[PDB]
Subunit: 116 residues, 3 copies
């Protein structure tokens, strides 16, 4: 239900809105979550502040953090890690090897929707 992507600053509006759609599209399908319950945001990392193996991109990648509450088994995570990863290689493209998808489970005692 919360997906943050850290990516390099090259991408255009269009790639952004299709990347949002896709992560959202890829999320509702795999884990069967509500579309209106899906939040995404992307984060432009400047080439001057993003390093692969110790040196900046400017001197020379896509990271996806998923925030679910814990109601998901390992198989439905395999599918999510799979679906999140595939559709981001489709639009706002990048090799599969260069996309990392992270799953952070939040205890229901630790996620607050409105007051509760």
């Amino acid at each position: 239900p919360n997906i943050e992507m850290f990516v390099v600053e090259g991408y255009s509006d269009q790639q952004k809105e299709a990347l949002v759609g896709a992560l959202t599209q890829a999320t509702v399908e795999a884990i069967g979550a509500p579309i209106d319950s899906v939040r995404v945001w992307l984060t432009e990392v400047p080439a001057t502040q993003f390093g692969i193996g110790g040196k900046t991109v400017a001197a020379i990648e896509s990271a996806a953090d998923g925030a679910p509450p814990s109601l998901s088994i390992i198989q439905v995570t395999f599918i999510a890690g799979r679906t999140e990863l595939q559709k981001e290689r489709l639009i706002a493209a990048l090799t599969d090897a260069a996309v990392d998808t992270v799953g952070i489970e939040r205890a229901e005692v630790r996620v607050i929707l409105k007051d509760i």
Copy 2:
């Protein structure tokens, strides 16, 4: 004690400084933490880069991650839940139901403050 609020790019300097005080005040009251211990950062997301349910805000939310050390019981989490939620629906307001709050407990073996962990203090 580590509070990142992800918000849209509208908010003025006043709203920011008031949002920072409010989340800090909310934290110290809720979890009885030292004010000196409370670091709060706001993350301004362009509308073109924030999606609600598949489409961007520009084509058409408040997300608060807290990284604390693990001591807090259920009730002091729920209060941290409501207190951060209320104070932010107060200043630089948005609807209650449009603010989401994430509580991440990092183990004492995994939190490093100065050179030392909290475990070896």
Copy 3:
């Protein structure tokens, strides 16, 4: 493998590349990870947007998130805590008092 440092928007290119290198080098040594598997990014927070005990920096600091896969034992974490504390005082410099490191275990 994933190191996000949040910092104020004051630092030069040189401080930045030396920070990326110092975080990568402190990483590869301690936890013996592959340089090419070490990604590190810096997130500039403007002063109006970074608050300590309730006031904005401007009205008047480093937080380092490490996300590895979950095998790491206590000592390699405390060493990780220390390697990435120290080499961030060497360059993009700051008093140790004002740096927190955060270790996030992630492993399906």
